């Protein structure tokens, strides 16, 4: 059972005292700024030796071994760096070790206030992610708040962390939610609208008409706007939805397939094609061939008057009147024969 699993996995470590908290933040920031001063040392970048710290701390080669087929070169961009600062005097080395212990501190910190995250996200169930899923995204929120927090602020880390938790959570549900992808601002305005609708549904003692709720919103909000975003609201309905009073009556197999041709349609198209194909020979040998271009027959792509004119060596005007007389000669044969009179839709 994967749920109660993490439930006992979090309580495996104590949370923290104020002391431990401040100490954690202490060695964290001192470590990171040590990485800064280290960036001034061998000329390395700010973020470079940082992730390199993860290279020799978070484990052996397992870290960058499989981050997709492309993340960042291990034997090239990492290896030499790991050996470039090994040659360096006491100062740069002490800064090194400071970096190591600092990042580790970041980790421990994260786990405690991860217990915290667990509670917070535990209150958010039913967003389309049952428990862990939700929680996990929520967790990473704290992570971003871990590096952005300062012990100097004299605030319990729980506060900052919490707000960032609700951040990660709401962004995650905004980006996942219904099966149809929806933009973040869009989701915002959605839950905004439904908020209002809820409120004045309870106040008015009844459900609001489109115009009064849309008015309750503000400027530019009308019945059509709410009706619109309401149409977008509802998600795709599952095909596996059983209908009727039985189990065996399904939904998915009740949908017609019009995206593909039908036998009647296949023979219909083949028919128009053939019947018109033989109706072709009764036209002037030149004007028929020309007519195959202007109407987009030969290669499927319609050729302009200029092109067909560039074909028979005649001006485009010629091709034009050619089309007039051709289509009308055909018109005689049609109005007479009454063979192709069908296909009138």
């Amino acid at each position: 059972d994967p749920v109660r699993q993490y439930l006992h996995e979090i309580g495996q470590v104590p949370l923290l005292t104020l002391e431990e908290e401040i100490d954690l933040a202490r060695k964290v920031e001192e470590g990171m700024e040590a990485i800064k001063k280290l960036s001034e040392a061998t000329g390395l970048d700010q973020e470079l030796i940082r992730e390199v710290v993860r290279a020799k701390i978070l484990g052996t080669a397992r870290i960058q071994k499989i981050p997709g087929l492309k993340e960042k070169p291990d034997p090239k961009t990492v290896e030499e760096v790991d050996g470039k600062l090994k040659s360096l005097p006491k100062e740069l080395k002490r800064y090194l070790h400071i970096a190591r212990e600092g990042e580790a501190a970041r980790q421990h910190l994260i786990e405690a206030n991860l217990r915290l995250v667990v509670s917070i996200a535990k209150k958010y169930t039913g967003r389309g992610l049952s428990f862990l899923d939700l929680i996990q995204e929520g967790n990473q929120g704290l992570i971003r708040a871990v590096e952005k927090f300062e012990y100097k602020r004299r605030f319990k880390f729980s506060t900052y962390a919490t707000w960032w938790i609700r951040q990660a959570i709401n962004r995650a549900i905004a980006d996942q939610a219904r099966t149809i992808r929806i933009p973040v601002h869009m989701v915002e305005t959605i839950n905004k609208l439904s908020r209002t609708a809820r409120q004045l549904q309870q106040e008015l003692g009844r459900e609001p008409s489109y115009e009064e709720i849309a008015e309750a919103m503000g400027p530019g909000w009308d019945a059509k706007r709410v009706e619109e975003t309401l149409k977008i609201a509802q998600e795709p309905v599952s095909l596996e939805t059983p209908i009727g009073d039985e189990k065996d009556s399904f939904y998915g197999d009740f949908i017609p397939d019009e995206n593909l041709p039908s036998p009647v349609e296949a023979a219909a198209q083949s028919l128009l094609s053939e019947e018109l194909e033989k109706a072709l020979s009764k036209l002037s040998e030149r004007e028929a061939m020309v007519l195959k271009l202007r109407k987009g027959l030969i290669d499927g792509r319609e050729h302009t008057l200029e092109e067909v004119g560039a074909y028979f060596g005649v001006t485009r005007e010629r091709i034009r009147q050619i089309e007039n007389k051709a289509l009308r000669k055909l018109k005689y044969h049609e109005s007479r024969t009454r063979k192709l009179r069908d296909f009138l839709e």
Binding site: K56, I57, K90, R94, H97, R100, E101
Partner: protein
Amino acid sequence: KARVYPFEDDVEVTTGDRVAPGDVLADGGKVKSEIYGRVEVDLVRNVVRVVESYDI
């Protein structure tokens, strides 16, 4: 459960590193740890300790 090997100058190794008997932890090739374990470097107290840990 561990064995302390306090150094003097710089260090050869880092925090987190596997060693075996007959290795030089620090001290420019002076101090030598005899046991298997993950070496941990404590800056302030100036010591590199070998906890008894097999890399597994």
